[model samples]
Target: STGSATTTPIDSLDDAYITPVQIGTPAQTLNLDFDTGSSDLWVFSSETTASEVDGQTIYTPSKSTTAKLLSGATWSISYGDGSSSSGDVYTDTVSVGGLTVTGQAVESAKKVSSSFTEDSTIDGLLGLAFSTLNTVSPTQQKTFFDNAKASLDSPVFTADLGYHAPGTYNFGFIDTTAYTGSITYTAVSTKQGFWEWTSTGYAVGSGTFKSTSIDGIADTGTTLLYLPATVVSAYWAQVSGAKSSSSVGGYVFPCSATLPSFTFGVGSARIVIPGDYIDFGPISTGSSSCFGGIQSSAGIGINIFGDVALKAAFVVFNGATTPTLGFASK
Candidate 1:
């Protein structure tokens, strides 16, 4: 049977999309961020230090009869943003939408960084990257999707990450009504445990498309689009009063400035991000400065097509023998 779930943005933060997931027996529900950039199903749990968890809900394994501790097994993960979490492991009945997987490894966080503890809305993270990226020590673990894929009619999922509005994540089947026109498919390389692909080129607004190839990853967990330094400079040059701000960080422009759209190439398809979306809200309450959603990936090495970019298109994460990415306008 196919499975589908509705993902809602947290208060238009546009940072991440969360869906309800059931773990253990009697179904203890928790809202988890479905991240495509990493692989580890971890949650704030009873094991977490009391001071470390604020308004976040904690998962109690003792409450679920199906929970079994994986003796000596542990996990720790740190994101590019420096946010981190670590914990011991347990095997439990994990389910998403209508799909269920028994004995799924659930890492219960005992420690979390300030960033995670402060963001009380995010109870946990459900990783969708390749199982090879799982952080369980000594022995690796499989993601919820990996364990359920064999039972699905089709081992694929679609991500319709809407801007400000709620979107749907469909597994085992593609919802044709979610997108318009034909999906343009591009082969992906998963050696890095990410859905990495090479873009033919990009252009500012309606400018001519360049032929330069760029290596990047489609990351649903990341909030902004990150490109090469030169590419970012080229785009910002078009905006009047745009400048790099040491205080604000990244590029900031006058809130009233008329920004231009940005386009990126995916095989033969051209996905365009409207200018208004590039203005990532105001910098401060009464400030006229706005942060540019597109920034440089210089130190990061690899580019990231985050929520700002993904929200503009319908994304298909094809998990076949040879993985591929399919994109189409929403």
Candidate 2:
């Protein structure tokens, strides 16, 4: 049998997606961000300080009979955006859709950054990356997917992210109807505990494709597409009034400017990112400047095919025999 869950955008940001997850024995349902960029299932809980609670729904482990403390275990995580959270560990039953995993490591947050506290809608994060990336101390933890993979018919999951519309995340099975055309498969290197692969090249607008190999990861947690500085500059060159702005960070262009589509190569497949999607709305409310979704991966080292890029295709994360990435037009 397979498990499926619907992912919905938060506040029309189109940057992150949240899906309902049931945790603990009594079933405390929480809307969590399913992040493929990290491997730690953490949530706002009774352990958190009252001042940091804000509007988040806290998880009360004491109310669940199956909850067990992990003695000396603790966890801390900081994201690329500088947002962070840390807390103690608890073992409880976690369920997604119809799939259930008992004794899952659920981190209860005792401390959180201002960013997390302000985003009250995000009760927690469910990491879908490799188990090796789990940040729990004393002993690493296995994600819900990892714990359930052994029992699944096949170890696979598909991400169907949409641009302002609702998408679906399917586990243990692929829904062919969700995508169009044939899926182009590429072997992935999982040495870094991420779905990292080298892209054949990329191009801006209808320009010639470069053959430079770019190493990057498919990250659902990141909001934008991050590529090399040269690639970002080349793409922005096609946009009339686009320029890199230190004040705004990244490339910003006139809101009325017509943007060009960006395309990346995976083996022989060319995935096109629509022009309109390139303009990630205005930089701020009542502002005439808009931010570019494609940015430089300079200090970040490896590039990232974040939500902006992933939403352009139906991605199949194959955890079978040899790890592979299967992408099809959506």
Candidate 3:
């Protein structure tokens, strides 16, 4: 979801997260499921105390000569999930794949929560999503994308999440060479910044499925692929020998066999999700199997298809090509 709004304090919780592509040199790298719901690039800093940092990746500015602080205007943000972190505002030359965007604005949050403050794997988050959700926006008032936009090779950057596999997040220009055929796009509407749509229906393998013809929104800030209650129940019923268990924030399915595959028809495009995504099992007893494909979000208004679905293809938010979003498979 993309939009332009005055750089305010971004009071809305919906605008606070994004899925960032985290990368390090040959030593380490991983694609981060970051949040743009807030406007802060929270990453563990290398100078962090050893005991304080656990599962989060700590980055040493010494590694990149290009790393430099914008001033002393540091920032921090806390989420409803009890996760919080603090860091400084810095600019450096950041690269994704062979593409490098110089003077990239980044926030080095040295102190992170247990979920993010421990692992020393990937470096920091690159918030190319929006500017309003920034914690530093109340101070510096600039987002990573706001500053890098001028230097980007093209008008837009694209995220190509490999379905059931890791995918690359390309900044600046989206490499369309990965597609074996022409691309398909959906026209943008003059509405909110979310990727909103009307779901035609869904299918489980060759079995028939049903869906509430409600508006579906595409968001990178969230991790779950949410659906209405009726759609979710109908989806699980199609899974042969599947049992429901509780896991994480939703229900999961314990299925011995390879779960049936599913597809979502967004307009004329049929977006597919692998069976593995639907086999979310429990981490402990009494926990419902991870609510595989769809989950119930009764009053969340519209449905949001998060990173799980967006990563399946090379998504082009062509605010430059035209006022529309283009989709192509890698």
Q: Candidate 1: give the clashing pairs.
A: none
lDDT of 2 at 152: 76
Which digits, one per residue and each the tens of the lDDT, describe model 1 over residues 123-213? 9999999999999999999988888888888989888988888898888998899999989999899999999999888999989998789
Give a tens-digit lDDT track for model 2, residues 172-281.
Answer: 99898998998999989889999898888998998999988989999999989999999999999999889999998889999999888899988899899998878787
Residue 198 CA displacement from its true place in model 3, Å: 4.9
Worst 10 residues of 1 by lDDT: 10-19
- The lowest-lDDT stretch of 10 consecutive residues in candidate 2 is 9-18
Angstrom error of the Cα, residue 159, model 3: value is 2.2
Q: Give the TM-scores of the predictions, in the order they appear.
A: 0.98, 0.97, 0.73
In candidate 1, how many Å is residue 164 off?
0.8
TM-score of structure candidate 1: 0.98
Candidate 3 per-residue lDDT over residues 258-325, each given as its tens digit: 67666776555666676665554543556544346466666666677766566555676553534456
